[model samples]
Target: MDDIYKAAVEQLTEEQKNEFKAAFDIFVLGAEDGCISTKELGKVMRMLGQNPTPEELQEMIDEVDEDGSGTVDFDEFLVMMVRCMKDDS
Candidate 1:
């Protein structure tokens, strides 16, 4: 995991962390070989009340998959989430 991800996770309360993990698990459940695909990304975004187009979705995955894997594994997905969320602290 990246330092940024670890930092964000540490900021979360235990309950908040569990809920976050649980939700991420749901996305992982339908992940493509344990990675989040563009289709899966759409579902996750919809759950967050977003309606990004497929092109935007592709851009999002590309942005998150820094390793050239064409998909975001759970760690990268978490990193993406942490980076996107507002850090009130």
Candidate 2:
């Protein structure tokens, strides 16, 4: 795993991290690249029954694009995931 990814999932147990990685793999949409593009994001969202409009999709991408690179990296995604998990507690 990349050091960035390791740091991002530091709070998660091994199993949780593995689970999260698997989830991320799906979001990546078969891209071997370390980041997910807006196109991949749209595919994932559609599979989950979400059909976000272009504006909404941009908003979502911007929210997770901490580096403003027009893509979501694992570090950003993991942070977002942990935040949502904590919010439920």
Candidate 3:
């Protein structure tokens, strides 16, 4: 997953990459000990310009919560980030 994420980032210009990391940094800080909850997922969706329903939000967390921990860690968030970018683009 890291390899895939790294390859995709390699395609970004420096400015785009920094902007991207800034979001990650901000989210990690707000995640409160490195994981985002289901409710937090909704906020992230809005940040990405989407207003997902509660059901959709659950689906997002489930989709990326690899360990089924019911929360999204940075690694999982990276997967989601890539998934969202690919799906939207």
Candidate 4:
């Protein structure tokens, strides 16, 4: 398994896991129609105080959307959040 998977399994509590899953479900539902728009990505970026270019945002979805359904699901979102939060620290 990847380091991220190992870390998530090792470090996340059951409650935290459930919470992340719920958040990811919401995110996936919001983007399920198609590619996430800049405005949608902007809201997330703003929360992170990160100024990402449109291309960058698309690249993020490309890299993180493991299912290739043009949207991210719970597991993918969990991984993305974990990686991003780790990077921030």
Total backbone collisions for each predicted model: 0, 0, 0, 0
Q: Cα lDDT of all candidates, in order?
A: 0.62, 0.58, 0.61, 0.52
Judged by lDDT relative to the true structure, which candidate is superior, 2 or 3?
Answer: 3
Put down candidate 4 lDDT per residue, 2-85, tens digits, no spaces: 464556545778977675444333334456552333335445444445554666666666766645556554554445455544
- Tell me which of candidates 2 and 4 scores higher on lDDT: 2
Comparison by TM-score, 2 against 4, better one: 4
Question: Which prediction has the highest TM-score against the true structure?
Answer: 1
Q: Name model 1 segments beyond 4 Å from true.
A: 1-5, 29-33, 49-57
Q: Any residue pairs clashing in model 2, and if so which?
A: none
| lDDT (Cα, tens digit) per residue for candidate 1, span 1-89 | 44555776567677775665655556665446666665676677566564556675577667666665666665666555666556732
Q: Estimate each model's TM-score.
A: 0.56, 0.50, 0.53, 0.51
* Candidate 1: pairs in clash: none
Model 4 CA lDDT for position 85: 48
Residue 47 shift from truth in candidate 2, angstroms: 8.1
Off by over 4 Å in 3: 1-32, 87-89
Estimate, for each residue in 2-89, the C-alpha lDDT of model 2 and write its tens digit.
4443444676778776664665578664434876776665565554454556666667557666566776667665554444334332
RMSD of each: 4.0, 6.3, 4.3, 4.8
